Design a protein around this ligand. Structure first.
Ligand SMILES: CCc1cn2c3c(cc(C(=O)N[C@@H](Cc4ccccc4)[C@H](O)[C@@H]4NCCN(Cc5ccccc5)C4=O)cc13)N(C)S(=O)(=O)C(C)(C)C2
Length: 371
């Protein structure tokens, strides 16, 4: 697994990517790692924001599937042509797989100027694959065709400009975290869906029906930047965060994610922004654990200037990259569970720590799920 340590790079707010090759001879591309979708897709035609793209002409192993495809994301969309080809991950397990690939021929607000990735690796399950669930996702192909175990782990690290991390394919690398792993069930195999059973801000319970926390659903999504919260929860949370930080004032466009807020270098008043604890359903009866998030996670750095990285959703909670940052996150597909621990690259505050703590007792956790 040491071969996979530090195999991710990215720019802040523009995702994390891993190097892969496609085709014979191998064509090299940077691919964003997305646990929030299920298609493997690459630029396959010129685009202003692509430094390179997949050239199907030049691969002896390419096979056309004679079928088109499109995927609408929350941010941007693309369309293209389905095919298969041979795929490797150079800083990955030592294997070559024949996988479905969507060649992107048109797109809208998908590729990001200067991001340095040319494609996307949807690691979630077939149920949300386009055009439908008969298009086997990449990780399913990988597992079926090799002896790679059915799990991967993600260590997303913040700054320390440019970001990095590790994607361990096939297991858990114990040098990437400290303390104990805490596991929450995958509620259903489509998104990496989970259930949040309690929320506290600076130790104060939001005191909402826990169904609200999962209104629609809650997912763990490395392809989304922000922590995204259903309307009612978002409003409760911002209220509590404003009140905690009310010795300063911010344009409420800051609270909407539109405007930066800046302080003289090294003077950011971290102490006035609360910690946020999300309690997740545990593995045994009436048992949960919490992950605690620092303001250094949800004030994304862009003097020292930041964007508010908590925003509103209408498709459920999205535990995005800024939540995953500093945690070591195990996507244990084999045992239908998501593990969290404190990362080796965890986020540092001089008087506060990000934590994964348990056990907690929580009654009636099944009521927190939404139908
Ligand atoms: C990193 C750029 C980025 C910046 N922001 C957002 C952003 C979101 C998403 C987002 O969308 N990510 C997609 C994949 C993707 C990744 C890179 C570029 C395009 C797309 C993911 O897959 C998502 N996972 C849940 C289900 N769905 C819908 C779906 C797809 C396929 C099958 C079923 C369902 C997603 O699209 C990306 C960004 N923000 C809104 S936000 O964080 O708050 C923001 C601060 C306003 C800005």
């Amino acid at each position: 697994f040491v071969e996979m340590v530090d195999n991710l790079r990215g720019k802040s707010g523009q995702g994390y990517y891993v190097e892969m090759t496609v085709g014979s001879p191998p064509q090299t591309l940077n691919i964003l790692v997305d646990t929030g979708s299920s298609n493997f897709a690459v630029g396959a035609a010129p685009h202003p924001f692509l430094h390179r793209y997949y050239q199907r002409q030049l691969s002896s192993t390419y096979r056309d599937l004679r079928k088109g495809v499109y995927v609408p994301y929350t941010q941007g969309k693309w369309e293209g042509e389905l095919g298969t080809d041979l795929v490797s991950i150079p800083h990955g397990p030592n294997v070559t797989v024949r996988a479905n690939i969507a060649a992107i021929t048109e797109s809208d607000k998908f590729f990001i100027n200067g991001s340095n990735w040319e494609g996307i690796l949807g690691l979630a399950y077939a149920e949300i694959a386009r055009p439908d669930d008969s298009l086997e996702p990449f990780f399913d192909s990988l597992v079926k065709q090799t002896h790679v175990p059915n799990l991967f782990s993600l260590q997303l690290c913040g700054a320390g400009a440019s970001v990095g991390g590790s994607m361990i394919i096939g297991g858990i690398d114990h040098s990437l975290y400290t303390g104990s792993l805490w596991y929450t069930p995958i509620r259903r195999e489509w998104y990496y869906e989970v259930i949040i059973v309690r929320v506290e801000i600076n130790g104060q319970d939001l005191k909402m029906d826990c169904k609200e926390y999962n209104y629609d659903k809650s997912i763990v999504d490395s392809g989304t930047t922000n922590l995204r919260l259903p309307k009612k929860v978002f409003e409760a949370a911002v209220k509590s965060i404003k009140a905690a930080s009310s010795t300063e004032k911010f344009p409420d466009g800051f609270w909407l994610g539109e405007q930066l807020v800046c302080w003289q270098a090294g003077t950011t008043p971290w102490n006035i922004f609360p910690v946020i604890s999300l309690y997740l359903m545990g593995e045994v009866t009436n048992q949960s654990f919490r992950i605690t998030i620092l303001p250094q996670q949800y004030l994304r750095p862009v003097d020292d200037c930041y964007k508010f990285a908590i925003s509103q959703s209408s498709t459920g909670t999205v535990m995005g990259a800024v939540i995953m940052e500093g945690f070591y996150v195990v996507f244990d597909r084999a045992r239908k569970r998501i593990g969290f621990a404190v990362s080796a690259c965890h986020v540092h505050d001089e008087f506060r720590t990000a934590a994964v703590e348990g056990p907690f007792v929580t009654l009636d956790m099944e009521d927190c799920g939404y139908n």
